[PDB]
Every structure is written in structure tokens, then in C-alpha cells.
Design goal:
This protein is an alpha+beta fold. It has 2 domains: 71 residues, Alpha-Beta Plaits; 76 residues, Alpha-Beta Plaits (2-Layer Sandwich), CATH 3.30.70. Helices cover 27% and strands 27% of the residues. It has 4 helices and 8 strands. The longest helix is centred in the N-terminal third of the chain and has 11 residues.
Length: 147
């Protein structure tokens, strides 16, 4: 009847052999909430699928780090005029949380801001804008555009 398996794309450095890629796919498929993983050798992009009730997004980046790599990540803060309450936070969060290349983002329900942890590899500030424009709020960047 029920279950709900969500995807993510992510990026990791240290995969200088096919055996490194193999050990990510063969490693992630062991987590009890995970079903599947595929990682593109040389390009560095890891693509992972799980039931988020027992294994959620941050556990994937930590299980990748647990091989002895560096998960090639950055974080920034974003400012969200038009978020006014927890349901408003949840409205953008249910895209921002992972989009198609973000590792994690929890959206604030009173401070009108979100901490975004991501891979600076395959998307940018245009796609973040267009993901929030779809709900109807805006993005300004914390120091990096207007603050």
C-alpha cells in the first residue's frame, strides 16, 4: 500500500578509480532506508534513492564521508520575504530541501531565512530563484546579494 522512496543528486571528490565509484554504490545500498545508488566516475556526481522515514539526506553525505573521501560541499544562507509561518517555510522547503543537487536545507519558520548546503557543481542562483518564484516569494543572498 504505502512507502515513498525519494531521490537526490550530490558530488564527492576522491574517486580516481572505478573501485571508488563501486564502493559508493555497494556502500549506500546497505543502509536500511536506502534502496539504490548510481555514481558517475570522473564526473563525480552521486545519485541516491531512499525511504526518508529511516534514512534521510544528511545520512547519505555522512556515509559517503565514512569511506575517507571529501564530499565537495559548500553552504550559504538565503533570505525569504514572503515566508510568514511554518506552512510557508514547508512550501519552499519541499523544493529547497534537496532540489536536484542540494545536500540539505531546513527552512526557518520565524527568522524568514534558510541555511542551504549544496554542491557548487551543476546548478546556480538562477535555479534557486526559479524554485522559489514557483511558490511566489523571493530570494536575497546573505551578504552575497542585498543581505
Amino acid at each position: 500500500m504505502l512507502s515513498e522512496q525519494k531521490e537526490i543528486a550530490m558530488q564527492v571528490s576522491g574517486m580516481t578509480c572505478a573501485a571508488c565509484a563501486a564502493r559508493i554504490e555497494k556502500g549506500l545500498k546497505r543502509m536500511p532506508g536506502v534502496t539504490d545508488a548510481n555514481v558517475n566516475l570522473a564526473t563525480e556526481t552521486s545519485n541516491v534513492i531512499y525511504d526518508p522515514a529511516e534514512t534521510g539526506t544528511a545520512a547519505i553525505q555522512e556515509k559517503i564521508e565514512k569511506l575517507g573521501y571529501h564530499v565537495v560541499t559548500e553552504k550559504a544562507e538565503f533570505d525569504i520575504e514572503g515566508m510568514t509561518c511554518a506552512a510557508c517555510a514547508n512550501r519552499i522547503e519541499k523544493r529547497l530541501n534537496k532540489i536536484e543537487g542540494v545536500a540539505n536545507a531546513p527552512v526557518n519558520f520565524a527568522l524568514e531565512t534558510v541555511t542551504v548546503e549544496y554542491n557548487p557543481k551543476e546548478a546556480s542562483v538562477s535555479d534557486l530563484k526559479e524554485a522559489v518564484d514557483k511558490l511566489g516569494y523571493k530570494l536575497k543572498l546573505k551578504g552575497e546579494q542585498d543581505s
